[PDB]
Amino acid sequence: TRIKKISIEGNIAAGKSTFVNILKQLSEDWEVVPEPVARWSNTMEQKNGGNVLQMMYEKPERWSFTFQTYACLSRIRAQLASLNGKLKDAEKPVLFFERSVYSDRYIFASNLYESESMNETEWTIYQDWHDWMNNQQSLELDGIIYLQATPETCLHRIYLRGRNEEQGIPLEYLEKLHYKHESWLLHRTLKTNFDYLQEVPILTLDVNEDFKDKYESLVEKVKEFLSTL
Amino acid sequence: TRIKKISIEGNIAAGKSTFVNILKQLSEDWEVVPEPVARWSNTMEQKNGGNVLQMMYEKPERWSFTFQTYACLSRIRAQLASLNGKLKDAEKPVLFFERSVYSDRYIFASNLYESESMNETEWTIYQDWHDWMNNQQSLELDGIIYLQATPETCLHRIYLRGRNEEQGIPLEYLEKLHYKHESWLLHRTLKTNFDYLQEVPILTLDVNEDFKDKYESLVEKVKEFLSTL
Ligand SMILES: Cc1ccc(-c2ccc(CCN3CCN(C)CC3)cc2)cc1Nc1nc(-c2nccc(N)n2)cs1
Ligand SMILES: Cc1ccc(-c2ccc(CCN3CCN(C)CC3)cc2)cc1Nc1nc(-c2nccc(N)n2)cs1
Ligand SMILES: O=c1ccn([C@@H]2O[C@H](COP(=O)(O)OP(=O)(O)O)[C@@H](O)[C@H]2O)c(=O)[nH]1
Ligand SMILES: O=c1ccn([C@@H]2O[C@H](COP(=O)(O)OP(=O)(O)O)[C@@H](O)[C@H]2O)c(=O)[nH]1
Ligand code: NA
Numbered sequence: 001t002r003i004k005k006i007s008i009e010g011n012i013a014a015g016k017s018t019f020v021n022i023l024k025q026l027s028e029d030w031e032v033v034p035e036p037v038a039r040w041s042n043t044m045e046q047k048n049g050g051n052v053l054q055m056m057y058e059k060p061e062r063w064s065f066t067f068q069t070y071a072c073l074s075r076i077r078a079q080l081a082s083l084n085g086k087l088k089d090a091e092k093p094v095l096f097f098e099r100s101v102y103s104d105r106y107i108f109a110s111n112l113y114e115s116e117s118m119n120e121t122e123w124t125i126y127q128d129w130h131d132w133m134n135n136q137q138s139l140e141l142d143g144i145i146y147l148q149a150t151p152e153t154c155l156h157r158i159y160l161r162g163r164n165e166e167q168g169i170p171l172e173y174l175e176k177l178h179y180k181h182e183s184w185l186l187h188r189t190l191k192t193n194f195d196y197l198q199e200v201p202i203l204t205l206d207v208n209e210d211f212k213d214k215y216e217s218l219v220e221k222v223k224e225f226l227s228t229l
Numbered sequence: 230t231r232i233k234k235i236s237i238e239g240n241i242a243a244g245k246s247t248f249v250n251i252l253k254q255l256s257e258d259w260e261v262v263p264e265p266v267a268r269w270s271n272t273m274e275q276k277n278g279g280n281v282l283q284m285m286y287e288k289p290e291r292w293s294f295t296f297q298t299y300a301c302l303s304r305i306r307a308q309l310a311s312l313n314g315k316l317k318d319a320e321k322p323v324l325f326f327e328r329s330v331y332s333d334r335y336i337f338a339s340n341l342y343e344s345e346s347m348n349e350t351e352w353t354i355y356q357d358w359h360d361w362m363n364n365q366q367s368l369e370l371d372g373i374i375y376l377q378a379t380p381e382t383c384l385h386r387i388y389l390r391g392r393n394e395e396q397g398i399p400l401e402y403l404e405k406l407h408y409k410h411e412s413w414l415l416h417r418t419l420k421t422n423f424d425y426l427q428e429v430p431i432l433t434l435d436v437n438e439d440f441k442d443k444y445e446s447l448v449e450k451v452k453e454f455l456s457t458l
């Protein structure tokens with residue numbers, strides 16, 4: 001029938017990839033679109049993405065615009081392709097997106113503008129492109145699952161995941177991203193050019209406690225949430 | 230009925246803007262989409278474009294990717310808007326595009342890559358974005374009118390038009406762009422990811438002689454060309 005689209009949102013190393021790969025396995029009606037940036041961080045997209053990530057570590061204020069535009073186009077095409085290719089013989093089809101087009105802009109790109117890694121012209125061009133690129137759209141979300149963790153939990157999980165380039169990320173940065181997610185998804189204080197988002201259902205899940213071998217209660221809340229949509 | 234789409238192609242100051250504003254007036258069935266870059270060179274797009282042009286004059290190797298992506302998105306939306314808003318009560322509707330999506334990539338963006346104003350990653354990202362952005366398309370061309378002028382004619386016409394920032398453009402640069410237009414539109418030696426372009430009809434017009442008050446013979450060739458499409 002109609003595929004349900006659910007974004008999984010959360011800070012760096014909150015556990016979105018872990019959670020998505022749990023969900024993947026529990027039902028033939030449940031599919032997953034991993035975040036392109038996540039995969040680049042692990043082929044022509046993969047080659048461009050690896051180069052942009054490395055370039056960004058050196059000089060965020062030169063590459064933030066290029067990076068954000070490509071990260072968002074790569075997400076849009078990977079999401080469209082899952083919508084068109086998968087779950088068509090399924091009865092209650094669900095697509096779980098690792099993050100969204102809205103996190104790209106209102107979390108990451110916004111944060112880079114706010115750090116002066118994009119200048120006003122780059123941020124304005126980026127918003128114009130984003131506003132327009134997302135009309136020329138059937139990616140509209142049925143609901144958002146927020147994986148809520150403390151900055152400290154995420155900082156610990158960055159250490160656990162043990163990526164060289166990430167070991168430098170400081171608590172202060174994560175506390176910034178955390179704050180943006182609280183404003184957007186909990187207090188719902190964040191305005192956007194996407195009217196329907198104000199009324200989109202949000203499930204908030206506390207993932208401060210390890211869930212890798214103990215996720216039944218989280219999946220129960222996901223199944224209840226899905227029944228309301 | 231079905232709007233016919235014709236790109237007007239030519240080197241800098243060949244006379245495309247002059248020619249398009251002649252055509253505009255000759256028929257209620259004839260509409261024109263000026264090139265966004267041309268208008269920026271004369272409002273939020275206008276403000277972004279002015280800033281990007283000025284930034285480009287200072288540092289082409291920093292802004293070529295940002296400039297080319299925005300110039301092409303601005304063209305795509307201005308072309309789409311003319312296709313959807315105009316010529317609907319008209320019997321033999323024609324839209325004349327000042328340049329195309331194909332000149333953006335195969336002339337300008339290509340030329341900037343070739344001058345090392347874009348690095349390989351920027352050029353590859355740009356081509357990926359272009360390939361994909363132009364599927365998510367009803368802008369396909371019925372025919373191309375090539376306004377063919379010598380580099381010297383164009384250099385003279387840059388002096389005539391008398392834009393401060395352009396008075397620095399050297400013959401060598403124009404000879405480069407000229408060569409690209411000859412390869413693409415005359416010898417048809419240039420390959421592209423747009424199969425149909427190999428078979429698109431091209432009218433070549435010599436505009437070395439001033440036509441502003443003497444254009445009847447050119448318009449006669451345009452009307453004959455249109456009757457074949
Ligand atoms: C790879 C990489 C390299 C570098 C950076 C980075 C480093 C430092 C700073 C602060 C700059 N300061 C300059 C001086 N000032 C005084 C203070 C500030 C900002 C950024 C970040 C990333 N990853 C990102 N990943 C996304 C991302 N992830 C998913 C989705 C999506 N859309 N974007 C965004 S940044
Ligand atoms: C505004 C502006 C400022 C600057 C330039 C510019 C200047 C110099 C150079 C050569 C660099 N060199 C560096 C060192 N090397 C040794 C040799 C080379 C390249 C470029 C050009 C433009 N306009 C353009 N306009 C379009 C354009 N027009 C319509 C449509 C469309 N898509 N693009 C492209 S560039
Ligand atoms: O309940 C959890 C969730 C995550 N992790 C680990 O924490 C890191 C971050 O998880 P993930 O990469 O899924 O986070 P994402 O960036 O996708 O949110 C990884 O090493 C996980 O194996 C964990 O040990 N227990
Ligand atoms: O037959 C012509 C065509 C053009 N021009 C002048 O040459 C310059 C370049 O023309 P245009 O701006 O139309 O060129 P485009 O860049 O649009 O090709 C302008 O000053 C025109 O008025 C001219 O004097 N006679
Ligand atoms: Na599944």
Ligand code: NA
Nearest residue numbers: 253256257259
């Ligand atoms: Na007209």
